[PDB]
Amino acid sequence: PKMRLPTRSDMICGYACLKGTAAMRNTKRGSWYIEALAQVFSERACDMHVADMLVKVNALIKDREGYAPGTEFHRCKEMSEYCSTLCRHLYLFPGHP
């Protein structure tokens, strides 16, 4: 009798938007979520775990709003989330040793 595993575990999944909603994208700069993701990860992978970085990406997305004058999407919002079956901190430890 060794320790066994659930069928699925040790996953983290980041979604650009919430159930039943749309994710926003700028036609020049790209998606809000990816842009935010790149900024946080590149800046903080060195000292923050991925789940926490994703909370940080949540904060950026909550404060953003659409620029789409004359259209129904002007000032529109989006909210990101993540779901996690991780069982330890996930530090990416960039550039070490």
């Binding site: 996953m11 999944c13 994710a23 979520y33 330890r88 996930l90 430890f93």
Partner: protein, 159 residues
């Protein structure tokens, strides 16, 4: 883009409570971008997806991942090639995995360029403990840039 490296001290005081993550490369990464939709159900061309795709490929290389890339794929092509990727033998000697999926979509599924759908459960399943034994116990990250609906979030006023 520039990735600040971690300090040795940070590694020493954090490695014990974290997933083992020191393999070179850190993992395989896959960035799968659909931008041009040539299919039945008309899906608007994902202008700006080119910058999304470039940013992740760059990001993941700089985080130390071996980046694989697929563009403009059908539902079936996404499924087959996701399975080929999950089954690659490098996963045994790496410490983690990254899959980023960028496309149009609906709740719980994403669109191929053919306007057909791939269910996200089927995708996560390809990397689970039964189907991808080589990633057992290893952190697997997914990032999904895709709509999960059609209605605009009009937003709410802050009281």
């Amino acid at each position: 883009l520039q990735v600040k490296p971690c300090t040795p001290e940070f590694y020493q005081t954090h490695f014990q409570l974290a997933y083992r993550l020191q393999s070179r490369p850190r993992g395989l990464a896959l960035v799968l971008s659909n931008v041009h939709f040539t299919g039945e159900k008309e899906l608007e061309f994902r202008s700006g997806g080119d910058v999304d795709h470039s940013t992740l490929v760059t990001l993941f290389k700089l985080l130390g991942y071996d980046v694989h890339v697929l563009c403009d794929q059908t539902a079936q092509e996404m499924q087959e090639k996701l399975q080929n990727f999950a089954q690659l033998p490098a996963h045994r000697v790496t410490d983690s995995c990254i899959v980023a999926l960028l496309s149009h979509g609906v709740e719980g599924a994403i669109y191929g360029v053919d306007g057909k759908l791939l269910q996200l459960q089927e995708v996560f399943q390809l990397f689970d403990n039964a189907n991808c034994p080589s990633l057992q116990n290893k952190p697997k990250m997914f990032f999904i840039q895709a709509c999960r609906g059609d209605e605009t979030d009009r937003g709410v006023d802050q009281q």
